[PDB]
Curated annotation (Swiss-Prot):
EC number(s) reported in the record: 1.14.14.25
Gene: CYP46A1
Gene Ontology process terms (BP): bile acid biosynthetic process; cholesterol catabolic process; nervous system development; progesterone metabolic process; protein localization to membrane raft; regulation of long-term synaptic potentiation; sterol metabolic process; xenobiotic metabolic process
Catalytic activity of the protein: cholesterol + reduced [NADPH--hemoprotein reductase] + O2 = (24S)-hydroxycholesterol + oxidized [NADPH--hemoprotein reductase] + H2O + H(+); cholestanol + reduced [NADPH--hemoprotein reductase] + O2 = (24S)-hydroxycholestanol + oxidized [NADPH--hemoprotein reductase] + H2O + H(+); 7-dehydrocholesterol + reduced [NADPH--hemoprotein reductase] + O2 = cholesta-5,7-dien-3beta,24S-diol + oxidized [NADPH--hemoprotein reductase] + H2O + H(+); 7-dehydrocholesterol + reduced [NADPH--hemoprotein reductase] + O2 = cholesta-5,7-dien-3beta,25-diol + oxidized [NADPH--hemoprotein reductase] + H2O + H(+)
Organism lineage: Eukaryota, Metazoa, Chordata, Craniata, Vertebrata
Pathways involved: Steroid metabolism; cholesterol degradation; Lipid metabolism; C21-steroid hormone metabolism
Annotated Gene Ontology cellular component terms: dendrite; endoplasmic reticulum; endoplasmic reticulum membrane; postsynapse; presynapse
InterPro entries, A to Z: CYP46A1, Cyt_P450, Cyt_P450_CS, Cyt_P450_E_grp-I, Cyt_P450_sf
Known tissue expression: Expressed in brain. The mRNA was broadly distributed with higher levels in gray matter zones and lower levels in regions rich in white matter. Not detected in fetal sample but its expression increases linearly with age.
Protein name listed in UniProt: Cholesterol 24-hydroxylase
């Protein structure tokens, strides 16, 4: 009853229902999400006010399903799910060091090697007949990149290794989904969560043992994760961040890659342009250097446009502590505010012809979206891995475009599913040919 005065109702996802309601009912709408009444706020003035201020913090109630699933600690109080500002701030500042320009430059070798491995595997299947799940292949690639870059671990999923680990990730993601919106499922979800955390403990022990023997350990994300816990009473905080980075550091990247490949399969003219760009910039070099990345301007634009229509992470929540007028609507104190880049990206008020895929929206001369586009969020709680993700996906995409042509198998759909993140409904089944065929 405390919300009844707020405007709202009396391969398709809940975010689409939210979009319809925002269009119908305006910039402040009451909805039900993850068992709780929330208010979806979709004006750019509100996006700016709430995300660009340390006064507003995340609503912990909306992150519970990350923290713990079916009584098994998952991300716990790691970097995504920690909602107390001072606790968040301490760990952010320490982990930031691993995402410095110089840090990320050093990761180019890893990005290149895994992308090259993927392309060689795909080239061997490029007979224009064999169906290849690009979602699967891109997920394996993203996992292999993350594991190596962040932890110095070789998962070798591209070689078909670590099937248990692969299963654990999938069931855990299903657990998150079920938590927020029987006996065998509970059992499998719980065991998968404990497995992921045990992977953490095992790899942490290996790291500590390497350090003790004075073996060479290149500074990475894990270094800073360890550093953040220097004087902790237990390793539970460390394992929180292990699992946080293990999952967050590949899932969304994989989703973004899958969406991009899927969309480009029906954009032959754009693909031709991307191919030409890659041809001119990198030529027949096997390896992309860091300075090549900035030169792939048209690819940057396509990837931005991909994130506008297909953000893997649709948005974020802030807790409104005191009653506030938002765009002419009285919103009670202690209310989760829902921000959605998915919704605003598809609103004609913010983007002309919103369903049209147009990389030119992000062209040099074009007016930049002002608080209407935030696939990595905005403000202090924006994605720590934003530049990491942008680099790795550009490396992977450039290498695909250099070497291969992709056709979506007829019957494959362009719809989304909502399953902890947004991802293609279908496996993005494609046939492949070498370029110049
Ligand atoms: C295209 C790929 C990616 C997208 C679209 C994405 C999107 C986002 C979004 C929307 C948030 C804010 C979440 C919230 O408010 O609850 C976020 C935060 C975060 N992302 Fe990402 N992300 C991506 C890749 C990565 C990568 C590669 C890493 C790690 C290597 C990563 C780690 C994180 C972490 C740790 C946070 C929490 C940061 C903080 O609160 O201080 N993400 N990301
Ligand atoms: O669960 C989230 C969330 C926000 N960010 C992420 C990321 C992520 C960010 N960067 C890379 O990965 C991954 C996942 C995971 F593990 F489910 F796939 C969940 N999240 N929430 C915020 C939205 O509102 C509801 C609760």
């Amino acid at each position: 009853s405390r919300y009844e005065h707020i405007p709202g109702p009396p391969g398709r996802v809940l975010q689409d229902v939210f979009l319809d309601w925002a269009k119908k009912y305006g910039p402040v709408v009451r909805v039900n999400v993850f068992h709780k009444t929330s208010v979806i706020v979709t004006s750019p003035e509100s996006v700016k006010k709430f995300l660009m201020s340390t006064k507003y913090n995340k609503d912990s109630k909306m992150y519970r399903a990350l923290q713990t699933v079916f009584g098994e600690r998952l991300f716990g109080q790691g970097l995504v799910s920690e909602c107390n500002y001072e606790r968040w701030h301490k760990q952010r500042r320490v982990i930031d060091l691993a995402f410095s320009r110089s840090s990320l430059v050093s990761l180019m070798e890893t990005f290149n090697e895994k992308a090259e491995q993927l392309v060689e595997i795909l080239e061997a299947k490029a007979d224009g007949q064999t169906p290849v799940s690009m979602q699967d292949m891109l997920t394996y690639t993203a996992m292999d990149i993350l594991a190596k870059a962040a932890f110095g671990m070789e998962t070798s999923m591209l070689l078909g290794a670590q099937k248990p680990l692969s299963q654990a990730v999938k069931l855990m993601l299903e657990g998150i989904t079920a938590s927020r919106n029987k006996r065998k499922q509970l059992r499998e979800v719980r065991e998968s969560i404990r497995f992921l955390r045990q992977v953490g403990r095992d790899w942490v022990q290996r790291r500590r043992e390497a350090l003790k023997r004075g073996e060479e350990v290149p500074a990475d994300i894990l270094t800073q994760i360890l550093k953040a816990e220097e004087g902790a009473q237990d390793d539970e905080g460390l394992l929180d961040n292990f699992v946080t980075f293990f999952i967050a550091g590949h899932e969304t990247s994989a989703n973004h890659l899958a969406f991009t490949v899927m969309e480009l399969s029906r954009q032959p003219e754009i693909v031709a342009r991307l191919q030409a760009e890659v041809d001119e910039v990198i030529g027949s070099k096997r390896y992309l250097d860091f300075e090549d990345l900035g030169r792939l301007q048209y690819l940057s634009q396509v990837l931005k446009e991909s994130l506008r229509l297909y953000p893997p992470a649709w948005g974020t929540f802030r807790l409104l502590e005191e009653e506030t007028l938002i765009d002419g609507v009285r919103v009670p104190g202690n209310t989760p505010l829902l921000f959605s880049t998915y919704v605003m990206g598809r609103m004609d008020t913010y983007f002309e012809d919103p369903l049209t895929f147009n990389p030119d929206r992000f062209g040099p001369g074009a007016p930049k979206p002002r608080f209407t586009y935030f696939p990595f969020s905005l403000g202090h709680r924006s994605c720590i891995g934003q530049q990491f993700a942008q680099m790795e996906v550009k490396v992977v995409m450039a290498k695909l475009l250099q070497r291969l042509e992709f056709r979506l198998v007829p019957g494959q759909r362009f719809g989304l599913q909502e399953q902890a993140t947004l991802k293609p409904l279908d496996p993005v089944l494609c046939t492949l040919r070498p370029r110049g065929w």
